[PDB]
């Protein structure tokens, strides 16, 4: 039972400077994994800049001023990972946690009737006592009666306010997916093929809007729409399009020159 988390051992996506401290806020168990989460203290202090330090972050959080999935969280070690809707009603923040093309966490601003919607990737299906079909998603939710067509890998559209499923998107070829882990994290493409290896990891090959083919393990894909144009969730600024590094460097240099 480990309670601490060194800053060097902390995930790089948290963007915590190595000289500021020795420790980082260890994520408490919960919805998302320790390596694939962004703690509420980090979100409220190092991202939103609302709190200048951990003390003010605690004063903000312990009042229940920050809502994650329509429920106030008083813990600064709450995981608060991917697809999570974080709303501050006092400031009316309402942003969703997504991945950008660089793989870092991004705060995509939402609106009403969009902050009520959350997508969940079904990671398991099992029958509970009373012969009740239960679907377990990527954030730890257990849906008590999902769509009869739900299968492992498909995504469900969840209404966080009403706590009910509103739609199901199957994991089929041609669907639009976002890569959730690995080297292609944050990229958005369409499934062109899924090589199935019984006993081993399946490999999904995807092609983005520009036509660049890239592969990844099938456990790292997350269906977000029926097509690369009709997405069921808003994505970050880059629209999941990885840019060539040389072209990006020249564009940044040109923009910096044009600023002055």
């Amino acid at each position: 039972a480990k309670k601490h988390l060194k800053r060097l051992y902390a995930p790089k996506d948290w963007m915590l400077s190595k000289l500021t401290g020795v420790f980082a806020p260890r994520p408490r168990p919960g919805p998302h994994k320790l390596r694939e989460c962004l703690p509420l203290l980090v979100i409220i202090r190092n991202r939103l800049k609302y709190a200048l330090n951990a003390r003010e972050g605690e004063m903000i959080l312990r009042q229940g001023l920050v809502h994650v999935d329509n429920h106030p969280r008083r813990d600064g070690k709450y995981p608060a990972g991917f697809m999570d809707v974080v709303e501050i009603p006092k400031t009316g923040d309402r942003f969703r946690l997504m991945y950008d093309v660089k793989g870092r966490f991004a705060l995509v601003n939402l609106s009403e009737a969009e902050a009520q919607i959350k997508l969940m990737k079904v990671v398991n299906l099992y029958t509970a006592t009373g012969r009740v079909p239960v679907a377990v998603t990527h954030d730890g939710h257990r849906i008590r009666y999902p769509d009869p067509h739900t299968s492992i890998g498909d995504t469900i559209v969840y209404n966080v306010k009403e706590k009910k499923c509103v739609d199901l998107i199957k994991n089929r070829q041609g669907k639009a997916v976002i890569v959730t882990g690995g080297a292609n994290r944050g990229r958005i493409g369409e499934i062109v093929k899924v090589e199935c290896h019984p006993g081993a990891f399946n490999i999904a090959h995807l092609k983005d809007a520009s036509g660049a083919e890239f592969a990844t393990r099938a456990a790292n894909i997350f269906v977000i729409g029926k097509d690369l144009n009709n997405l069921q969730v808003t994505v970050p600024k880059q629209q999941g399009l990885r840019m060539n590094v040389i072209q990006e460097r020249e564009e940044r240099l040109i923009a910096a020159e044009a600023r002055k």
Binding site: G130, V132, R144, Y145, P148
Partner: protein, 95 residues
């Protein structure tokens, strides 16, 4: 006896101090439940039975959906079979 106020008969001890004012100390009556506590206790059971009934209703909804889907498939299959059979019997009639 029952239905009698207990707070009136509680032991009150007298504290006398130089100057100030005489102090009367009485214990906080534990296990004395007011009508508010009774309302809370009844509300607990009401909520439990409501939750169980709601779960039963959800089970009924799911079962009805499953059975309706099976019914629709069954009668589509039987309508197709009836069309095939009627085409077969048309040829049978009058050789």
């Amino acid at each position: 006896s029952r239905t009698e106020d207990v707070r009136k008969y509680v032991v009150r001890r007298r504290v006398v101090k130089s100057g100030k004012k005489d102090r009367l100390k009485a214990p906080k009556i534990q296990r004395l439940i007011t009508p508010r506590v009774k309302a809370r206790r009844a509300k607990k059971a009401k909520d439990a039975i409501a939750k169980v009934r709601a779960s039963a209703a959800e089970r009924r909804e799911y079962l009805r959906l499953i059975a309706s889907n099976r019914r629709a498939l069954r009668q589509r299959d039987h309508s197709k079979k009836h069309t095939r059979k009627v085409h077969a019997q048309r040829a049978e009639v009058a050789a």
